[PDB]
Structure formats: structure tokens, C-alpha cells
DNA sequence: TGGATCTGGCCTG
DNA sequence: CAGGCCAGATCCA
């Protein structure tokens, strides 16, 4: 279930146009993020009790706001 | 005339050219690290200790009301005499110059525990422009203490600066400044005997005189063998500055000054030409109204010092200096700067 | 216009190249100062250029996103990546990020970082190291490159 | 017995 | 595999 949640969350901040080709995924990003966070905090207390990666923090807190502000994430990435 | 190697702890990569060694009650400290201060030492000052030829750079906390100051990479240090320490200007790590004044003092001391106190002094009047490599000393004339300031190197003015020559540097004007510590005021004075600019010289203080000798002039790419004596008096009205040119000077730049005995100073290290290195030492014996420069014995330098290109250091205070020689390459890390100590 | 392959090797145009260490801050600043100078100079100007027989003018809006986490930490006046303050977008601690994990808001910016460094250097409230860091939210250096708060997709994927 | 002194762990690379 | 920050085990005057 955790892997499925991550794979549902991924296509938003990796697509050049997350507002067009992944509308349902963009809309359900918040619900998937909350599910991911609660799953971590409940079932994985042996890894995420008092410490969590800043990249998980970003993916669970800041991605939708950046999408709304800019329009896309991944077109501005460092791949080029 | 004794030369020894001093090792380093795990903070070798924290000493860069242009540091300053500041001494309080026989305890020497480090200033001017490389890179912005990390969490390991948020204050930025360091404890310099040589025991059995080994260096351990313990941090040093500040006072509650102190101001945390950026690493000055080429400042002007002064030893005021109720003991304080003066640093003014220099390069910050991001390579912009500062024109503000920091005052140092030891706030409190415990069993092998030291706390400093930093205050920021603002100057009003003819404020000297930001620069680096300049020299600051103090004079004591008729119950009044006040420090003299000279020119160094500074960037082009904000109206003649271009991006293609952003980092180009030109010597400051040879104006002699009189900055007052207890009032934060300055009066700019121009003296005819000083026509060409001077940078990275060595200056020596006495009762009511300062001896500036050596220095690099960037205008014509020469190092004059000059020697100027500046006399300051403090009447009721405005102070007066008189400069006299004396013969027998030396042609050095970015040399190291230290005190061996009372009315006794020695110049060690420096640069004679662009590709030439000052391999001799000069004993400058001061007095009441007379100066005499003679050559002392040449210390036995090792091959690493003799065949290097850059050395740098400061004054420990107790008849000792601390010069550095670059070591090996940089990719192999670990030991990158070879550090030596010299006994006078 | 709209770039078809924004992440391809065919769209990025080299502008300044050097052989210097990333973390060697002194020479990094020495080399990159002119480019930031031109950036700030031209951020509020207008460019007139001849286009096929008709003159046309250009405005410019700059967005900095192509910096990895270590570069952002170094050039935005921030601490190391292993510090208590983790995110370069909000002022939250690692522990508090672990108890909440959901609700946040972006509040960091270049001007805010500059004024936080000014507060850190001036010490206008007469506080100790810990109190001053708690006041400045982890700012201990002067930033010199302006970037927008954004997430690097490649490194986010690698870390996850 | 309360700060020094390592020391492995965690984070980005 | 280098580099930095941090909570925890020694430890010594
Ligand atoms: Zn955050």
C-alpha cells in the first residue's frame, strides 16, 4: 500500500504539465499525502519516530503549493 | 633563530591566507577562517594553542551583548592599551569589502574558559572608504590616545566599475586619517610628502610616532624602499600631522612584525619582488627620536620554505610568529598547508 | 513559444564555466559575482533588438530552480544539510516536521534571508548563540544568489 | 559528577 | 565514498 501511494503521488512533480495530463492525480495528491504520512507515523515507528527525510517532508508538504505557484515541476528540474 | 614544525588537529582546512592572530593576557587566538562559520564554531574565533608542537583549535564563545562578525580575510589589527583589540575593514568571504569597526575584549574568564566581547563602532565624518591590507596603529600624546589609519587597496568607485573588471583593484588615496575611538570621529588630512599610494606595508607604533616602511605601489608595479615617520600632537584644537622621509628604508610588502624586547622589533618574511622572496630578517631598533635598521643573522630555512612561492602569517606576541607554507595538492586533502613556527 | 523538451541537452545554453570546487566559497563568489551583477542590473531594464526588419523590445523574468539541495544551502546563507532546520522553503525543525508532516507553507525568500543575516550579524537583542539561531531560523551566512523556492525532481526521486 | 571527547548515525551529495 | 550536524557512550580531573 505504501508503494502504491508513492507511485500515485509521483506523476505530479515529474510531468511537464501536471495540470492537464494528471488531473485526478493532482486533485488526490493531498489525500495520498495524508495517507502516506499516517502510514509512516503508524506502521513505521522504527524509522520515522523523531527523524524524517527532508525530501519526504517536501513531497508531503510543499509540492502542491509549488505546482500552483509555477505551473509545473520537472520542466524546471536539473535534468538538462 | 629556531625554526620548528607545528602539527594540526582535525581543522587544518580552516586556516587561509590573511588570518589574524590576536593575543589576550598571553593567550593567542585565531581569526579569519575559510568559509562561513559552521555549527561547530558559530562565533568564528578560535583558540590557538601550541603544546609539544601541536595545534588544537577549540572554539570560543562570545558575550550575550556581543555582535557576531564575518570572517575578515585581510583586516587591520591594532593593539590598544582596560585592554581591547581593534579590527577595521577587510574582505568578507563573499568577496565584498566592509567599512565598519569591531572592538574586541575579554568579557569573562573561567578555568581554561574564555569569552570575548565584540562591539561595532560607527564612524562619522571623513569615513575611510572600504579597503584591505591597510595598517592601523595608535599613538599616545599628552594624555590622549588616538589611532592613525593609512591607505591600502580598494575596488574601483561605484561609478567607474564594470562587470568585465568587477574584481579589479586600485590603491587607495595616500590620505592620512585620524580616527578617534572614544568618540567615533575622523578627520581626513593630506600631506605633501606622501604622493604615491602604499599597500600591504608594515607599521610600528611608539610614544607619539608611527613608522611606515616598505609597501607595494600598484600604480607603477614597484616596491619602494621608503621609510616615513608620522608625528602626531594633540592640542586643544584640531590635531596636526607631520610626515618626514628618512633614509635607510627597506623595500618589503606583506611582511610580519613582532616584538622581541622593549624598543625592539623584527621584520620576518615578506616579498621583495613579484617572483622574489624576502629570505632575510631585519632588526629595527627604535628609540626616542632615532631609528636604525641593521641586518640580523639569516635563519636556517628548510627546503620547503626556500622553494615555495607563498607564505603568510601573523604575530603571536611572545617573541614568536606563525608562518604557513602550502603543502602537496588539494585533491588528496588531509594535509594541505604545512605550518611552521619561528623563534626570535 | 514553449520549450518542447525542457530537460534535454539541446536547450541548456552554457554561460559560465570554471574549474573550481563547489564548496570553495571564496573562488565561487569571485567567479560568479559578475553574472549576478549583470542579472540584478538587467532585472529592471528593457532590451531593444532588431528582429527581421522590425525593432522589438524584450522584458526578462528570471526563475532559479536548477540548483541541488547542497547548492541552495550554500548560496542562500543557510547551514549544512544535516542541520535541525531541514527545508529550504519553510522554517520548521526536523523533529516538528516529523510530528506534523502534513500542513506547512512556504515563507522563505532571498530578501528575508538577507535581513535574517543582518539580524544575526548585528545581534540587536543581546542574545546568545542558541537564542540568536532560534531567532534567525538557521541563517548564518550572507546569500549572494537569488533563487525561487523549488524542488529538484531528479534528486527528489533519487533520495526517495 | 558535570562538562570534554570521541563516535556511530543520518542527511545531502 | 568525502563532508557536516547531532544524540549517545566514555571519561577524567
Ligand atoms: Zn519544508
Per-residue 3-state assignment (H helix, E strand, C coil) for chain B: CEEEECCCCCCHHHEEEEEEEEEECCEEEEEEECCCCCCCCCCCCEECCECCCCECCEECECCCCCCCCCCCCCCCEEEECCCEEEEEEEECCCCCEEEEEEEEEEEEEECCEEEEEEEEECCEECCCCCCECCCEEEEEECCEEEEEECCCEEECCCCCCCHHHCCCEEECCCCEEEEECCCCEEEEECCCCCCCCCECCEEEECCCEEEEECCEECCCCECCCCEEEEEEECCCCCCEEEEEECCCCCCCECCEEEEEECCEEEEECCECCCCCECCCCEEEEECCCCEEEEECCCCCCCHHHHCCCCCEEEECCCCEEEEEEECCCCCCCCCCEEEEEEEC
In the Cβ-directed half-sphere of B106, how many Cα atoms lie within 13 Å? 17
Scanning the structure block, which residue is given the C-alpha cell 515541476?
A73
Q: Which subunits count as partners of chain B given 3+ CB pairs below 8 Å?
A: C
- Which of these, B174, B178, B231, lies nearest to B201 by C-alpha position? B174
- Which of these, B210, B191, B313, lies nearest to B257 by C-alpha position? B313
Resolution in A for the shown PDB structure? Answer: 3.4
Scanning the structure block, which residue is given the C-alpha cell 604575530?
B315
Q: Rounded to an integer, what distance in angstroms lies between the CA atom of residue B84 and that of residue B106?
A: 8
| CA pseudo-torsion sign B312, B77, B31, B88 | negative
B264: left (phi over 0), alpha (psi -120 to 50) or beta: beta
Q: Rounded to an integer, what distance in angstroms lies between the CA atom of residue C137 and that of residue B58?
A: 25
Distance C135 CA to D2 C1' (A): 28
- Chain C positions with Cβ closer than 8 Å to A: 3, 6-9, 11-12, 63, 65-69, 81, 86-87, 89-90, 92, 94-95, 97-98, 101-106, 148-157, 159-160
Q: Rounded to an integer, what distance in angstroms lies between the CA atom of residue B312 and that of residue B330?
A: 18
Under 8 Å between Cβ of B224 and B196: yes
What distance, in Å, lies between the first and last C-alpha atoms of chain B?
5
Method used to determine the 3D structure: cryo-EM
Neighbours of B244 (CB within 10 A): 12
Under 8 Å between Cβ of B43 and C129: yes
Under 8 Å between Cβ of B221 and B244: no
3 state SS of C51: strand
Under 8 Å between Cβ of C69 and C89: no
Phi, psi (rounded to 5 degrees) for C34: -60, -40
Neighbours of B107 (CB within 10 A): 15
Kind and range of the H or E element at C50?
strand C47-51
Under 8 Å between Cβ of C160 and A6: yes
Under 8 Å between Cβ of B71 and B37: yes
- Which of these, B332, B38, B95, lies nearest to C25 by C-alpha position? B95
Rounded to a whole number, what is the largest CA-CA distance in chain C?
Answer: 65
Q: Rounded to an integer, what distance in angstroms lies between the CA atom of residue C148 and that of residue C89?
A: 9
Q: Is B165 on the interface with C (CB under 8 A)?
A: no
Burial A23-54 (b: 16+ CB within 10 A, else e): eebbeebeebbebbbeebbeeeeeebeeebbb
For the record, the C-alpha cell of B187 comes out as: 578627520
For the record, the C-alpha cell of B333 comes out as: 586533502
C-alpha pair distances (Å), C146 with each of B187, C62, C109: 39, 9, 8
- Which of these, B231, B187, B181, lies nearest to B206 by C-alpha position? B231
Under 8 Å between Cβ of C107 and C92: no
Cα dihedral B77/B79/B84/B89 (nearest 10):
-20
Q: Rounded to an integer, what distance in angstroms lies between the CA atom of residue B323 and that of residue B333?
A: 20
Q: How many residues does chain C have?
A: 160
Phi, psi (rounded to 5 degrees) for C122: -75, -35
Under 8 Å between Cβ of B40 and B29: no
Q: Rounded to an integer, what distance in angstroms lies between the CA atom of residue C94 and that of residue C85?
A: 6
Phi, psi (rounded to 5 degrees) for B177: -100, 150
Q: Do chains C and B touch (3 or more CB pairs under 8 A)?
A: yes
Q: What totals of helices (H) and strands (E) does chain A contain, helices first?
A: 4, 0
Q: Rounded to an integer, what distance in angstroms lies between the CA atom of residue A15 and that of residue A17?
A: 5
C-alpha pair distances (Å), B59 with each of B13, B70, B172, B321, B337: 15, 15, 35, 21, 20
What distance, in Å, lies between the first and last C-alpha atoms of chain C?
34
- Which of these, B229, B243, B241, B151, lies nearest to B197 by C-alpha position? B151
What distance, in Å, lies between the first and last C-alpha atoms of chain A?
33
CB of C159 under 7 A from strand E? no
CB of A58 under 7 A from strand D? no
Q: Rounded to an integer, what distance in angstroms lies between the CA atom of residue C9 and that of residue B16?
A: 38
Who's near C20: CB < 8 A, 6+ residues apart? C27, C28, C31
Who's near B10: CB < 8 A, 6+ residues apart? none
Under 8 Å between Cβ of C111 and C127: no
Q: Rounded to an integer, what distance in angstroms lies between the CA atom of residue B28 and that of residue B46?
A: 9
- Residues in C 90-149 whose C-beta is less than 7 A from nucleic strand D are none
Task: Tell me chain A's radius of gyration from C-alpha atoms.
Answer: 13
- Alpha carbon of C32: minimum distance to chain B alpha carbons (Å): 10
- Which of these, B4, B2, B8, B1, lies nearest to B327 by C-alpha position? B8
Under 8 Å between Cβ of B102 and B62: no
Under 8 Å between Cβ of B134 and B179: no
Scanning the structure block, which residue is given the C-alpha cell 587561509?
B16
Q: Is C141 on the interface with B (CB under 8 A)?
A: yes
Q: Rounded to an integer, what distance in angstroms lies between the CA atom of residue B324 and that of residue B338?
A: 6
- Which of these, C127, C124, C106, C104, lies nearest to C116 by C-alpha position? C124
Amino acid at each position: 500500500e505504501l508503494m502504491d501511494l508513492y507511485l500515485k503521488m509521483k506523476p505530479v512533480w515529474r510531468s511537464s504539465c501536471p495540470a492537464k495530463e494528471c488531473p485526478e492525480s493532482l486533485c488526490q495528491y493531498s489525500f495520498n499525502s495524508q495517507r502516506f504520512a499516517e502510514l509512516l507515523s503508524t506502521k513505521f515507528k522504527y524509522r520515522y519516530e523523531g527523524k524524517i527525510t527532508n525530501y519526504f517532508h517536501k513531497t508531503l508538504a510543499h509540492v502542491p503549493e509549488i505546482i500552483e505557484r509555477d505551473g509545473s515541476i520537472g520542466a524546471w528540474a536539473s535534468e538538462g | 633563530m629556531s625554526l620548528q614544525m607545528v602539527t594540526v588537529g582535525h581543522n587544518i582546512a580552516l586556516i587561509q591566507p590573511g588570518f589574524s592572530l590576536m593575543n589576550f593576557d598571553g593567550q593567542v587566538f585565531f581569526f579569519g577562517q575559510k568559509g562561513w562559520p559552521k555549527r561547530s564554531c558559530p562565533t568564528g574565533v578560535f583558540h590557538f594553542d601550541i603544546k609539544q608542537n601541536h595545534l588544537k583549535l577549540k572554539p570560543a564563545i562570545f558575550s550575550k551583548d556581543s555582535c557576531y562578525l564575518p570572517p575578515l580575510r585581510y583586516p587591520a589589527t591594532c593593539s590598544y592599551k582596560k585592554h581591547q583589540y581593534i579590527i577595521h575593514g577587510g574582505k568578507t568571504p563573499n568577496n565584498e569589502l566592509s567599512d565598519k569597526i569591531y572592538i574586541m575584549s575579554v568579557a569573562c574568564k573561567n578555568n581554561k574558559k574564555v569569552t570575548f566581547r565584540c562591539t561595532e563602532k560607527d564612524l562619522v565624518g571623513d569615513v575611510p572608504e572600504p579597503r584591505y591590507g591597510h595598517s592601523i596603529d595608535v599613538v599616545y600624546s599628552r594624555g590622549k590616545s588616538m589611532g592613525v589609519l593609512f591607505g591600502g587597496r580598494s575596488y574601483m568607485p561605484s561609478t567607474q566599475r564594470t562587470t568585465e573588471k568587477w574584481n579589479s583593484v586600485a590603491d587607495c588615496l595616500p590620505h592620512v586619517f585620524l580616527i578617534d575611538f572614544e568618540f567615533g570621529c575622523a578627520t581626513s588630512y593630506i600631506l605633501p610628502e606622501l604622493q604615491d599610494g602604499l599597500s600591504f606595508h608594515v607599521s610600528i607604533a611608539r610614544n607619539d610616532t608611527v613608522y611606515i616602511l616598505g609597501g607595494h605601489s600598484l600604480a607603477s608595479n614597484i616596491r619602494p624602499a621608503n621609510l616615513y615617520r608620522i608625528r602626531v600632537d594633540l592640542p586643544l584644537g584640531t590635531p596636526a600631522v607631520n610626515c618626514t622621509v628618512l633614509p635607510g628604508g627597506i623595500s618589503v610588502s606583506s611582511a610580519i612584525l613582532t616584538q622581541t624586547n622593549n624598543d625592539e622589533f623584527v621584520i620576518v618574511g615578506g616579498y621583495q619582488l613579484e617572483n622574489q622572496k624576502r629570505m632575510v630578517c631585519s632588526l629595527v631598533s627604535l628609540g626616542d627620536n632615532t631609528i636604525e635598521i641593521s641586518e640580523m643573522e639569516t635563519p636556517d630555512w628548510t627546503s620547503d620554505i626556500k622553494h615555495s612561492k607563498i607564505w603568510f602569517g601573523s604575530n603571536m606576541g611572545n617573541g614568536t610568529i606563525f608562518l604557513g607554507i602550502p603543502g602537496d595538492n588539494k585533491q588528496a586533502m588531509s594535509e594541505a598547508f604545512y605550518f611552521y613556527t619561528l623563534r626570535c | 513559444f514553449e520549450e518542447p523538451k525542457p530537460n534535454s541537452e539541446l536547450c541548456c545554453k552554457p554561460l559560465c564555466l570554471m574549474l573550481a570546487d563547489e564548496s570553495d566559497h571564496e573562488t565561487l563568489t569571485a567567479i560568479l559575482s559578475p553574472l549576478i551583477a549583470e542579472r540584478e542590473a538587467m532585472k529592471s531594464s528593457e532590451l531593444t533588438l532588431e528582429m527581421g526588419g522590425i525593432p522589438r523590445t524584450f522584458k526578462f523574468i528570471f526563475r532559479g530552480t536548477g540548483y541541488d539541495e547542497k547548492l541552495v544551502r550554500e548560496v542562500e546563507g543557510l547551514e549544512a544539510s544535516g542541520s535541525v532546520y531541514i527545508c529550504t522553503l519553510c522554517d520548521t525543525t526536523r523533529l516538528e516536521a516529523s510530528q506534523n508532516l502534513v500542513f506547512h507553507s512556504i515563507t522563505r525568500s532571498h530578501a528575508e534571508n538577507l535581513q535574517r543575516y543582518e539580524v544575526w550579524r548585528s545581534n540587536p537583542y543581546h542574545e546568545s548563540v542558541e537564542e540568536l539561531r532560534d531567532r534567525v531560523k538557521g541563517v548564518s551566512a550572507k546569500p549572494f544568489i537569488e533563487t525561487v523556492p523549488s524542488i529538484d525532481a531528479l534528486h527528489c526521486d533519487i533520495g526517495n
